[PDB]
Each structure stands twice: as C-alpha cells, then as structure tokens.
Design a protein around this ligand. Structure first.
Ligand SMILES: [Cl-]
Ligand SMILES: [Cl-]
Length: 129
C-alpha cells in the first residue's frame, strides 16, 4: 500500500509515534517519505547482504528475520515480511524499539540526511489529526 502523507500521519499518531522518545510526528512522516516513498512494500538490499523492509526500511541485520541474513539478529521478533503489510502496526512497534536503543532516529540514514534539522512540521501541515 502507498500511503498518502496525511493518511500515514494519522496512522502513525494513532499508533503512538507522535513525540515518541521526543520525536514529533513530522519526523516520522519525513523519514517514511525518504526511506520508502510511503510504500509499505519497499525493499532494498544492502551491500552486506541484509535487506531493508517496509515503510521505515527496517534492516534484517538486526531487527527482523528474512531467512537469508546469516548471523543476523531478530530483535523485533518478527519475520521481515510482516513489515511489508498495509497494516503498519508491526513496523511502528519495531521502530519504537529501534528509536529507543540509544541512537534515536539517527538509525534511519534518510532521516539524518534529509529530515534532521529541517522544518519537519511541514510534513503534517494541512492534515486533520
Ligand atoms: Cl512535527
Ligand atoms: Cl540519505
């Protein structure tokens, strides 16, 4: 599923991401835009052979099991395919664990490089929340 911007903002707010660990909702929408273009089915392979999955491009090296990342962990205790569902619950719950692990949203390279230090509130402007 390809979310609209405000549709995704509302879904993320309902799932508790607004100000989660101090990150306002626009940060999460911005990160999703540049990680996946709001597409829950996005996948991208990394050089080390891991794969990033879903709307927030969660990496199989640490966070989910895809059966093909030898020596990886599955810290969210989910198959990576669960992160491609049109229901973002699995992605959000796993993202909460990632952002809580000490590096905040710097875990998402696109957030660091394209959202951090910008007017991220612009990403939820005009939405009914
Ligand atoms: Cl915001
Ligand atoms: Cl980037």
């Amino acid at each position: 599923k390809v979310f609209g911007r405000c549709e995704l903002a509302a879904a993320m707010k309902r799932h508790g991401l607004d100000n989660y660990r101090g990150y306002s909702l626009g940060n999460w929408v911005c990160a999703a835009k540049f990680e996946s273009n709001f597409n829950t089915q996005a996948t991208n392979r990394n050089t080390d052979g891991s794969t990033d999955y879903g709307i927030l491009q969660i990496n199989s090296r640490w966070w989910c099991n895809d059966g093909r990342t030898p020596g990886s962990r599955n810290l969210c205790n989910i198959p990576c395919s669960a992160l491609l569902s049109s229901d973002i619950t699995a992605s959000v719950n796993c993202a909460k664990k990632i952002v809580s692990d000490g590096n905040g949203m710097n875990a998402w390279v696109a957030w660091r490089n394209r959202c951090k230090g910008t007017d991220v509130q612009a990403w939820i402007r005009g939405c009914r929340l």
